[PDB]
From a paper:
Unlike TZAP, ZBTB10 requires two ZF domains to fully recognize the TTGGGG sequence, which represents a different mode of telomeric or telomeric variant DNA binding.
Previous studies have revealed that the juxtaposition of Asn or Gln with adenine is a generic mechanism for recognition of the adenine base. Based on the structural mechanism by which ZBTB10 recognizes the TTGGGG sequence, we rationally mutated Arg767 to either asparagine or glutamine and performed ITC assays to check their DNA-binding affinities. We found that the Arg767Asn mutant resulted in severely reduced affinities for both the TTAGGG and TTGGGG sequences. Next, we solved the structure of ZBTB10 ZF1–2R767Q in complex with the TTAGGG sequence. We observed that the recognition pattern of G4G5G6T7T8 was preserved very well. Furthermore, the binding specificity is also proven by a cocrystal structure.
Author numbering: 720 to 772
The structure:
DNA sequence: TTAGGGTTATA
DNA sequence: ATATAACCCTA
């Protein structure tokens, strides 16, 4: 099943949502806050976090 | 707030 | 079909 995660029982409705979900198992955090240096998994998370500054 | 589930739009 | 994006919801 191309919609099933190879690392857990999660099954996505769309292929793009499975690819996003894979990042929970790799731990990759490609986004950062320029003010405090904290790392984030999505760029929407940075915008959400920016409100503390 | 954090973080990952959901969704829809555009190319 | 993929790539990137954005916005909402919730524990
Ligand atoms: Zn998984
Ligand atoms: Zn910060």
């Amino acid at each position: 099943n191309k919609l099933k995660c190879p690392h857990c029982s999660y099954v996505a409705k769309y292929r793009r949502t499975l690819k996003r979900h894979l990042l929970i198992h790799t731990g990759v955090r490609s986004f950062s806050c320029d003010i405090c240096g904290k790392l984030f998994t999505r760029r929407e998370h940075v915008k959400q976090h920016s409100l503390v500054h």
